[PDB]
Amino acid sequence: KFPRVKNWELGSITYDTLCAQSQQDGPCTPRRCLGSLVLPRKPAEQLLSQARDFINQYYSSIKRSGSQAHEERLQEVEAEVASTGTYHLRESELVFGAKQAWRNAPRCVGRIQWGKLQVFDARDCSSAQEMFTYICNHIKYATNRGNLRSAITVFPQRAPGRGDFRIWNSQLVRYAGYRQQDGSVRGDPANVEITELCIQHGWTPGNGRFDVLPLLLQAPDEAPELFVLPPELVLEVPLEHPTLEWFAALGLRWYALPAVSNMLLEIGGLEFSAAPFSGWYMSTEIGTRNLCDPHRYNILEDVAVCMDLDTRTTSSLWKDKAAVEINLAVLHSFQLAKVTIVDHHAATVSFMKHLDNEQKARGGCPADWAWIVPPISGSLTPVFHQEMVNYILSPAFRYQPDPW
Amino acid sequence: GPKFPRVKNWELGSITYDTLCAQSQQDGPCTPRRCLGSLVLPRPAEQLLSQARDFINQYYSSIKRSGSQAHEERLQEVEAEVASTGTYHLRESELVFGAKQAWRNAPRCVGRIQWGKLQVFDARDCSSAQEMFTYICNHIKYATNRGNLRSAITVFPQRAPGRGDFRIWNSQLVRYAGYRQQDGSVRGDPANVEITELCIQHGWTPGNGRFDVLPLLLQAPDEAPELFVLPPELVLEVPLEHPTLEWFAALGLRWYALPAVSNMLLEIGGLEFSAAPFSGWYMSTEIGTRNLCDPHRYNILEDVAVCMDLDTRTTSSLWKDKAAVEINLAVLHSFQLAKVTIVDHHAATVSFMKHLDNEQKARGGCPADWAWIVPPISGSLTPVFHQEMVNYILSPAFRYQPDPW
Ligand code: HEM
Ligand code: HEM
Ligand SMILES: Cc1cc(CCNCc2ccc3c(C)cc(N)nc3c2)ccc1C#N
Ligand SMILES: Cc1cc(CCNCc2ccc3c(C)cc(N)nc3c2)ccc1C#N
Ligand SMILES: C[C@H](O)[C@H](O)[C@H]1CNc2nc(N)[nH]c(=O)c2N1
Ligand SMILES: C[C@H](O)[C@H](O)[C@H]1CNc2nc(N)[nH]c(=O)c2N1
Ligand SMILES: [Zn+2]
């Protein structure tokens, strides 16, 4: 049947009926539940049916379903696909698809914002070099002297029997991670592979802990070229703690723009293999994960030491204590630097309203509970106590293999 | 590769495959098109024989006598019993085996490293509500062990064909009362309101503290539940205090030492033990974060926060976070002071990683509910956050059942 969804702090109950229109399978079956898995294990009128749907969405979107602006566009798509085994989106259909993709993304806690999205059409792109300029202008628009702005840039759709446009980096801004022969890593351990790929394509590596990587940009069926971001573009914030004055002296810093460049944007059967998008950070992304994750910069113990805590045992909650001070120093710094950012408390509160908006508009909202609940203070936020239904709506952002 | 789920740990990069879920014979909440893993409660001699046979097989396999003559004789023995009396009965050691298995098979339990060490008390002879109370008193004494807590379960008679069930009406053996106020608010534990008013409807003389231990509502077959009050010295409590905040002690917060669930059904070989309370010991965050800081429980976060002189009028002061940490600290500190068994959420999840590693070798996987295994604070600061998990129902099982009223 149709799932009962309950908030356990409030006592309220909904019914997700939007899930009924899920056309692709998630990882689960009745026998096993694989909801905690980060990545998934894995003719022509399948395309044509995917594209019919998306068009129906778009015209229902702009109130005028079943007109003939509608049904003519239906015949365009059908005709185009019938003759070429593919078709093309009109720019405004693309702006719609891009907003629907964000709206539909079960893992995003920021979809209250989903309507306010700047879409740059960059399909008139024929080279790595053009790709670079597009990206450079994405970042300046999006960074916006620190008053950040949600933005996506969309490079040419994939094509049968032609390579893909790809951005090799996982994010537009990331820090180099140089493996030390001595087991260790200087910089961000999440970026070792790509760091070396850069080096491999002739980047002159630094030896810093927060060195900004260059971009490997790749036009179809050509070697990836390498581009170095004008240092002006990369807005960084130094971290410092509003009361702990030794904190600033930890040399910690984080870039301001969260822009993801390795996912696939799927609209109406069409796949866009380079379509980087960006927003602003939630504090816990920087302060809990990027800095305290054991397989990341992993600074819990350092801070703990300067906080003169009891590292000797876990039941002193030294880790917990350290973490809170880091998250505070990240909110402090960004606020003091006037760079946009949101705390996990503010974010999940707004997501709860989004849930309510969504429930009334579409009868539901696909959400991945494990990703929607922040990495600290789990039950201290309202989304913890909220049941969620998860499913794949299209348009959709997706994971795809790395181009090497 | 393998036709089984591939499971990865993102901290260590390590990979496993769950082969044990192939023996999950009962379907859960999710389907290919919808995941329902966040839901707390998703909704004949024929059928008995199957479950029966399966369990006996598990058993003889656990004692490495699978396909032996004792094995095939047990199966005939059960078939015979089911054939005449519609039901069948477990041997002592079968029961013990099943009880430990049901614990072992429990996805939401982070304490399962210990699953092999479980005192099973057989109360299948128990024949009155009066006797239920005595067994339950006995359990609490043994399990509490003056603060050196010991895990245990007590098993009262199984559901019988056309005969009322043994039921303990209370959710736990120890629960603080919830009193609906003249205002609308609740004094004490809002969770326990319904049971609290039921105690009263059944004759309890209610107090009015924040921490009034409820009486037991104990129901023998086809009899109205009878009220039983627990002798206060049997119910060990811990006065919460903070190692450096001297004022914390003044808040008069206490919690009881023994988590003991009394309303779950225990199922083995298709046999239903409607009343089979079991107990372990607390993990720090259960008390400090859920029970004391949940908006819909004692809700003391803002109060602690105000005492801490925090900016409770901005989310970004992380005043909620600062106070949550110190409340958990106070819980840990206080139980350690009182010499009462308690495990912090760090050390607990670390033990569970070892259990996972053990279960991988022993069975080919471990059924696990990620959202219940990850602590309610400091989530990613524990190893289990970075551990993918597979959730499926194995039997023997601890199940939920409707409230008897
Ligand atoms: C405007 C401010 C935004 C905030 C505060 C925000 C917040 C978040 C957070 C906390 C996550 C979890 C990611 C993680 O823990 O690694 C996430 C993921 C995600 N967000 Fe948002 N987001 C924002 C804007 C956007 C925009 C503009 C888009 C797309 C146009 C978007 C689409 C997504 C998608 C597709 C994911 C899944 C990430 C993945 O699986 O790699 N979000 N977001
Ligand atoms: C020995 C120390 C133990 C610890 C630290 C422990 C810890 C926990 C925790 C933290 C939960 C989460 C419950 C919640 O937040 O509501 C839980 C659940 C559970 N535990 Fe354990 N536990 C222990 C012993 C046991 C024992 C002895 C049994 C059974 C014989 C057991 C069976 C279960 C079951 C069935 C659940 C699921 C609760 C539900 O589904 O409502 N646990 N445990
Ligand atoms: C290692 C890994 C990591 C991730 C991380 C998820 N993506 C991070 C992300 C992606 C987009 C964001 C956006 C759009 C905004 C924001 N504040 N944070 C965002 C954070 C996903 C898959 C894998 C894999 N494999
Ligand atoms: C109201 C409610 C509450 C719960 C709580 C789950 N049971 C709590 C529990 C049960 C057994 C435990 C055990 C055995 C040990 C321990 N440390 N904590 C334990 C905690 C589950 C479902 C519902 C519902 N509906
Ligand atoms: C294994 C686990 O599912 C995985 O680490 C998830 C858990 N929840 C998460 N939640 C968010 N927001 N981001 C993440 O990367 C993860 N990782
Ligand atoms: C809605 C959500 O599933 C609910 O709050 C769950 C989350 N995880 C939990 N985890 C544990 N251990 N205990 C709980 O009661 C819950 N509640
Ligand atoms: Zn699932």
Cβ count near A285 (within 10 Å) = 17
- Angle of the B69-85 helix axis to the B45-62 helix axis, nearest 10: 160
List C-alpha distances in Å: B200 to A246, A361, B210: 58, 45, 17
Alpha helices in A4-125 (DSSP H): 45-61, 69-84, 91-103
| Token pair belonging to A92 | 């405004």
- DSSP codes joined into one string, A135-165: HHHHHHHHHGGGS---EEEEPPPP-TTS---
What letter would DSSP give residue A370? H
Give contacts of A32 with chain B, Cβ < 8 Å.
5, 18, 21, 24, 28, 390-392
Q: How far apart are CA B344 and CA B347, in angstroms?
A: 6
What residue type is assigned to position A301 of the chain?
E
CB pairs under 8 A between A and B: 216
Instruction: Tell me which ligand sits closest to the C-alpha of residue B31.
Output: 7
Q: Note whether B175 and B241 are same-domain residues.
A: no
Residue B378 near residue B8, CB atoms below 8 Å:
no
**For residue B396, is the peptide bond before it cis, meaning its omega torsion is within 30 degrees of 0?**
yes
| CB contact set of A108 (below 8 Å; sequence gap of 6+) | A102
Q: What is the dihedral of CA A173, A178, A179, A183, to 10 degrees?
A: -100
Among A292, A222, A281, A213, which residue's Cα sits nearest to residue A252? A292
> Smallest CA–CA separation between A313 and chain B, in Å?
9
Among B113, B110, B89, B87, which residue's Cα sits nearest to residue B100? B113
Kindly state if the Cβ of A371 falls inside 6 Å of ligand 5.
Answer: yes
Nearest residue on chain B to A300, alpha-carbon basis: B381
What letter would DSSP give residue B289? I
Question: After which residues does chain A become discontinuous at a C–N distance over 2.5 Å?
Answer: 42
Which residues of B are part of a known binding site?
30, 35, 38, 109, 172, 281-282, 286, 291, 371-372, 385, 400
Mark B245-272 as b/e (b = at least 16 C-beta within 10 Å).
beebeebebebbbbbbbbbbbbbbbbbb
Kindly state if the Cβ of B371 falls inside 6 Å of ligand 6.
Answer: yes
3-class secondary structure per residue, A258-304 = CEECCCEEEECCEEECCCCEECCEEHHHHHHHHHHCCCCCCCHHHHH
Residues paired with B121 in a beta bridge: B154
Q: Is B169 a catalytic residue?
A: no
Please report whether residue A296 resides in a domain: yes
CATH number at residue B141: 3.90.440.10
Kindly state if the Cβ of A401 falls inside 6 Å of ligand 3.
Answer: no
Residue B404 near residue B223, CB atoms below 8 Å:
no
B15 membership: H or E segment, kind and range: strand B15-17
Kindly state if the Cβ of B110 falls inside 6 Å of ligand 2.
Answer: yes
Among A133, A204, A119, A215, which residue's Cα sits nearest to residue A166? A215
Residue A142 near residue A148, CB atoms below 8 Å:
yes
A377 to B344: CB separation less than 8 angstroms, yes or no: no
Q: How far apart are CA B206 and CA B196, in angstroms?
A: 8
B374 to A378: CB separation less than 8 angstroms, yes or no: yes
| CB contact set of B1 (below 8 Å; sequence gap of 6+) | B17
Q: How far apart are CA A51 and CA A270, in angstroms?
A: 8
Q: Note whether B63 and B157 are same-domain residues.
A: yes
Instruction: Tell me which ligand sits closest to the C-alpha of residue B150.
Output: 2
Cβ count near B51 (within 10 Å) = 17
Q: How far apart are CA A181 and CA B219, in angstroms?
A: 68
Torsion A164-A165-A168-A169 (CA) sign: negative
| Token pair belonging to B34 | 């919808």
Please give the resolution of this entry in Å, rounded to 1 decimal.
2.5
SS3 content of chain B, % helix, strand, coil (to 5): 40, 15, 45
Residues paired with A281 in a beta bridge: A341
Q: Note whether A338 and A273 are same-domain residues.
A: no
Kindly report the protein residue whose alpha carbon is nearest to atom 9 of ligand 6.
B372
A37 to B7: CB separation less than 8 angstroms, yes or no: yes
What letter would DSSP give residue A8? T
Q: How far apart are CA B368 and CA A287, in angstroms?
A: 28
B295 to A32: CB separation less than 8 angstroms, yes or no: no
Among A370, A305, A379, which residue's Cα sits nearest to residue B10? A370
List C-alpha distances in Å: A71 to A49, A52, A74, A267, A396: 14, 10, 5, 18, 24
For the range B248-252, what are the long-range contacts, defined as Cβ-Cβ under 8 Å and sequence gap of 24 or more?
A: B248/B304, B248/B307, B248/B326, B248/B330, B251/B300, B251/B303, B251/B304, B251/B307, B252/B210
Please report whether residue B4 resides in a domain: no
| CB contact set of B372 (below 8 Å; sequence gap of 6+) | B107, B108, B110
What residue type is assigned to position B158 of the chain?
Q
Residue B349 near residue B384, CB atoms below 8 Å:
yes
Q: How far apart are CA A394 and CA A100, in angstroms?
A: 8
Please report whether residue A388 resides in a domain: no
Which of B8, B35, B320 shows the shortest C-beta gap to A35? B35
Q: Note whether B198 and B188 are same-domain residues.
A: yes
CATH number at residue A299: 3.90.1230.10
Give contacts of A387 with chain B, Cβ < 8 Å.
38-40
CA geometry: angle A150, A203, A133, nearest 5 deg: 35
A378 to B380: CB separation less than 8 angstroms, yes or no: no
Note the residue count of chain A. 404
Range of the domain at B131: 125-150+165-236+400-404
Q: Is B112 a catalytic residue?
A: yes
Q: What is the dihedral of CA B92, B94, B96, B99, to 10 degrees?
A: -130
B254 membership: H or E segment, kind and range: strand B254-256
Q: Is A221 left (phi over 0), alpha (psi -120 to 50) or beta?
A: left
Q: Note whether B197 and B315 are same-domain residues.
A: no
Q: How far apart are CA B312 and CA B317, in angstroms?
A: 7
Ligand 4 center to B109 CA (angstroms): 9
| Token pair belonging to B243 | 């190692």
Please report whether residue A3 resides in a domain: no
Please report whether residue A7 resides in a domain: no
Q: Tell me how far apart the terminal alpha carbons of chain B are, to the nearest angstrom.
A: 51
Residue B191 near residue B184, CB atoms below 8 Å:
no
Q: Note whether B28 and B40 are same-domain residues.
A: yes
Q: Note whether A70 and A98 are same-domain residues.
A: yes
List C-alpha distances in Å: B56 to B62, B63, B97, B362, B395: 10, 11, 10, 19, 12
**For residue A395, is the peptide bond before it cis, meaning its omega torsion is within 30 degrees of 0?**
yes
Which residues of B are part of a known binding site for L-arginine?
172, 281-282, 286, 291
| Token pair belonging to B138 | 């006995």
Q: How far apart are CA B86 and CA B75, in angstroms?
A: 15
CATH number at residue B358: 3.90.340.10
| Token pair belonging to B264 | 């779950």
Note the residue count of chain B. 405
Active-site residue set of A: 108, 111, 280, 285
Q: In what order do the strands lie in the sheet with B119-122?
A: B119-122, B152-155, B278-279, B260-261
Instruction: Tell me which ligand sits closest to the C-alpha of residue A107.
Output: 1
Ligand 7 center to B349 CA (angstroms): 22
Q: Is A329 left (phi over 0), alpha (psi -120 to 50) or beta?
A: alpha
| Token pair belonging to A67 | 């007109």
Please report whether residue A6 resides in a domain: no
- Of B330, B347, B364, which residue sits at a domain end? B347
What letter would DSSP give residue A352? H
Which of B293, B336, B388 shows the shortest C-beta gap to A37? B388
Residues paired with A27 in a beta bridge: none
| CB contact set of A252 (below 8 Å; sequence gap of 6+) | A238, A239, A291, A297, A299, A329
Residues paired with A350 in a beta bridge: none
Q: Note whether B26 and B157 are same-domain residues.
A: yes
Q: Note whether A104 and A84 are same-domain residues.
A: yes
What letter would DSSP give residue A2? P
Alpha carbons within 13 A on the beta-carbon side of B83: 6
- DSSP codes joined into one string, B128-164: SHHHHHHHHHHHHHHHHGGGS---EEEEPPPPBTTBP
Q: Note whether A44 and A97 are same-domain residues.
A: yes
Residue A283 near residue A344, CB atoms below 8 Å:
yes
Cβ count near B380 (within 10 Å) = 22
Mark B204-227 as b/e (b = at least 16 C-beta within 10 Å).
beeeeebbbbbbbbbbbbeeebbb
Q: How far apart are CA A113 and CA A350, in angstroms?
A: 9
Instruction: Tell me which ligand sits closest to the C-alpha of residue A293.
Output: 5
Among A371, A141, A404, which residue's Cα sits nearest to residue A277? A141
Cβ count near A361 (within 10 Å) = 11
Total domains present in chain B: 3
Among B55, B12, B111, which residue's Cα sits nearest to residue B266? B55
> Smallest CA–CA separation between A102 and chain B, in Å?
19
A389 to B347: CB separation less than 8 angstroms, yes or no: no
Torsion B278-B283-B284-B285 (CA) sign: negative
Ligand 3 center to A260 CA (angstroms): 7
> Smallest CA–CA separation between B230 and chain A, in Å?
30
| Token pair belonging to B159 | 């559901």
Q: How far apart are CA B83 and CA B76, in angstroms?
A: 10
What residue type is assigned to position A55 of the chain?
I
Nearest residue on chain B to A379, alpha-carbon basis: B376
Among B336, B241, B327, which residue's Cα sits nearest to residue B281? B336
Q: How was this structure determined?
A: X-ray
Mode of pairing for the β-strands spanning B119-122 and B152-155: parallel
Among B218, B204, B225, B128, which residue's Cα sits nearest to residue B168? B218
Give contacts of A289 with chain B, Cβ < 8 Å.
380
| Token pair belonging to B148 | 């050196």
Q: Which residues surround ligand 7, an ion (CB under 5 A)?
A: A 28, 33, 35; B 30, 35, 37
Give contacts of B294 with chain A, Cβ < 8 Å.
9, 379, 385
Which three-class secondary structure state does DSSP give residue A348?
helix
Q: Is B388 left (phi over 0), alpha (psi -120 to 50) or beta?
A: beta
Please report whether residue A115 resides in a domain: yes
Q: Note whether B156 and B47 are same-domain residues.
A: yes
- Angle of the A69-84 helix axis to the A45-61 helix axis, nearest 10: 160
Kindly report the protein residue whose alpha carbon is nearest to atom 19 of ligand 1.
A108
Q: Note whether A41 and A57 are same-domain residues.
A: yes
